[PDB]
RNA sequence: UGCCUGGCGGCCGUAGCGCGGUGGUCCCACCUGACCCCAUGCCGAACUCAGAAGUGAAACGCCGUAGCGCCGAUGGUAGUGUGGGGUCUCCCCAUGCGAGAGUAGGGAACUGCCAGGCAU
RNA sequence: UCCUCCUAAAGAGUAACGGAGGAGCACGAAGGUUGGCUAAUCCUGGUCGGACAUCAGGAGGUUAGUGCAAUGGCAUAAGCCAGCUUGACUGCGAGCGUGACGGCGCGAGCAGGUGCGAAAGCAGGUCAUAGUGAUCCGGUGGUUCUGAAUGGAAGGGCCAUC
RNA sequence: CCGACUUACCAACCCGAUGCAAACUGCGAAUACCGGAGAAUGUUAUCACGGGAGACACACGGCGGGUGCUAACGUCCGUC
């Protein structure tokens, strides 16, 4: 099961890569969570808002949730924009918009996003 | 005799014979008899070689034949004038160019396979002679 | 599993006539007894049966003698 | 779930003794139990394919699925796109509940049932086995049959050999011979 | 008879072959397959032709990891 | 081959039309595309009828 | 700073298969459980959610690994522009450019923005 | 007359009564988009099931497939399934490749209306290369452009079409 | 119903080894060709539009070739 997320996301992160928006990289694991934001050449990133970084994940309940992944949504948001970050376009990562992304990829429009 | 069971299309052109060989050492067994000059070989010619060799050696040992021809050579049939097409193929050729090994032979000894191999060395067009097996 | 498009399911009786009462669901509606149990039956100890060989001195020396 | 309460709780108990293992992943575990009840002959009749449809329906509670010939054979008058098998999958606690009408019940009732011979496991342990008719699932009515063509069970297991995936379904005294 | 046809092809291949410079609009390789793929700021057409879209020097760059032919647009 | 000509009409009430072609032996049943008009400026129904 | 582990990169088989060990505190997989959130052309197998009793077995990275694949010499080979010939159906000469296959060898990746854990 | 490889001499092009093959259609989806999936073949086990139906793993890894000939492509699949749709759009086009011209084809960015998707984005027919035909004359439906004294009408142009 | 029998028999899988190819390349030179930067060079020698005709039947010598038999002071080509 390992070798399905990165066959559906080979199209669209390489489709960002030509396209040259900055990037907005998803993760959907079970126990935890990670999001973070990518330069157009893939190889710097800037942000990091997951929930291994304990000093967010201590004032929530649970990490891996609906309201958790809506958490680090806003997470991301607010150490984004406080660094000037306008210009994002959204991977998916081949985890289907339902329940935790479509709360991670709202969370942060309802926290200040343009995409 | 030998002839191709199979090709893929049916007629092939005539192209050049220049380069020298690829088959050039004895591969499997103890004497050789080697081509010298440039040409082609009939399906007939190495056949009656292959009975006129055989019939010195008298059933022992064994005989390695490598060459196999398979070139379509046609002919524009007789009193037709030159144009309305190509010809139809009449026999399957092989093309031997200059040191190019036929046979391999074991087991007989020598000095009878000088003349075992001289008398079909008589019946082939183009200039052979002898040599043995090499130790690397 | 899709809400409506398979049947039904519903605990009842199967008990047997040598006595091993049990419950499975089915879709069979009405209680439905067993004849053969297999906590009894003939497979451990009723295959020896069949096969009735016999030696021939037997069957020589159980009709008759000399 | 009567023979997953008696799995988890005492199979284990005699799979980790004889077989020298370290964890609980180490033991075989059931994957699936599938049910094809093929008709081959429904060219004559769709209705011979949606009764075969619905007779093995009517033994575990799920409506099949209709599945189709793969690639064409000339022969049997077959091509791309005709549907002529009948498949049941079951997981979980459903193929407990399936089971035990199985091994309880449906294995006895047979005629002339003998036992079932102790090699069907293709080597890997995966189980085949093949009934030659329907009423042995007691769940039909009797003259309720328009024909008789039996299906074949197969176990679908987590075994990973014919010596170490046998003593799984012989924990549950599997009649073999 | 049998043998009296043939079609002259659609003089495809290179145009603007690697190393000089381009306007925005032009085509580089009319081809059939994706033969030379999809490089940097060119568009792959209809019938596959690699166009450009900027402006500038061309370049042959291999690329990817299935070693294929990329044909890229930078400004000059 | 039978794909003759059609006129798709615009149902705006203006009088344009498309013209395509449609197999009448597997398909008779009569066709409504709802296609772009270029004198009303709306997406319209196009009520369809013969090419003559 | 050091080591390990997680998404993304440069890289295009010296970077991949082989067989034998490995590591689960944290991370990752398995797993646990499932009514509304979604789910199957049958089915919690995939897909989604809720949670962490149990295991690092299968996955997943490491070291060991010349059975490979792969890279790769120098030297020799016929080809070959241009010019003179010959025993002109094809080869020799003076000049450069001189590869494929094989010999000696290397060879179990390397590296970067990032976050956590343990140590110094 | 057109289409595919080779002869054709590593760019385009290059002939003969030279060597081999296909076309003069189709498709209301076999189209646009979203989401998802991955083969041919043999081994082993299994109800009638046989060497070849369907079901199970398992080896192997495009040796398979494209509505059709080859050739070149193809995993992000351009191959295969489900949902919604009619962009199989109207006016345009910088800039090009190739013909002697009559041509033919690709085409970023714009306007006006949409479809898909949460979103960037994609879409001006089908993986592309064959599915073909100048002019005159003549028919259909619009068009206030003209209307041989004036208002009209016949007829002619105009764009769509046969 | 079965089956032990090898028997100068052939034969796909695969293996160590050997060749051939216009219609198949896991490799692949020279020379030839498009475009920029430059040194010396030649009677602008390179295009542009405008006036006027010629020609549209070619052969042989060397090289890479396709009909022909690697025959023809033979034919059909690209090239000097
Ligand atoms: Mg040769
Ligand atoms: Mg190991
Ligand atoms: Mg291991
Ligand atoms: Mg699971
Ligand atoms: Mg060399
Ligand atoms: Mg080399
Ligand atoms: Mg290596
Ligand atoms: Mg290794
Ligand atoms: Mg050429
Ligand atoms: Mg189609
Ligand atoms: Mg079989
Ligand atoms: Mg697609
Ligand atoms: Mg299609
Ligand atoms: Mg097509
Ligand atoms: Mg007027
Ligand atoms: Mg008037
Ligand atoms: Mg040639
Ligand atoms: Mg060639
Ligand atoms: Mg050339
Ligand atoms: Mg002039
Ligand atoms: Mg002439
Ligand atoms: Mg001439
Ligand atoms: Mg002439
Ligand atoms: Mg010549
Ligand atoms: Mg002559
Ligand atoms: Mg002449
Ligand atoms: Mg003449
Ligand atoms: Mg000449
Ligand atoms: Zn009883």
Redesign the interface.
Known sequence: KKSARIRRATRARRKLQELGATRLVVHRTPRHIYAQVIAPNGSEVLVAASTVEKAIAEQLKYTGNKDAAAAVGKAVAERALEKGIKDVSFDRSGFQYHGRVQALADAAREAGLQF | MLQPKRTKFRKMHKGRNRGLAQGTDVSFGSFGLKAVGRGRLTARQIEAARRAMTRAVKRQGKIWIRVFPDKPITEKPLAVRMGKGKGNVEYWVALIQPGKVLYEMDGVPEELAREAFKLAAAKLPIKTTFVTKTVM | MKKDIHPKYEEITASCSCGNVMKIRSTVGHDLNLDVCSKCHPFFTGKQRDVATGGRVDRFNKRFNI | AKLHDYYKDEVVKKLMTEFNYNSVMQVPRVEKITLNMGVGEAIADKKLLDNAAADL??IS???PLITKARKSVAGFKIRQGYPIGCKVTLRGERMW?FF??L???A???IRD???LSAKSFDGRGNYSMGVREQIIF??IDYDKVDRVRGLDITITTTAKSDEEGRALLAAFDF?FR | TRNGRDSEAKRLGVKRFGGESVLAGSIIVRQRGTKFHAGANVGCGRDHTLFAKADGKVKFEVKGPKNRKFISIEAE | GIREKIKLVSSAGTGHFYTTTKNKRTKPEKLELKKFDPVVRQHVIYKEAKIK
Request: aromatic share 4%; net charge positive.
């Open positions: 329906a009517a509670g799920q409506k509940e035990e009408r091994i309880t019940i294995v006895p009732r049932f003998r036992g007691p769940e009649p």
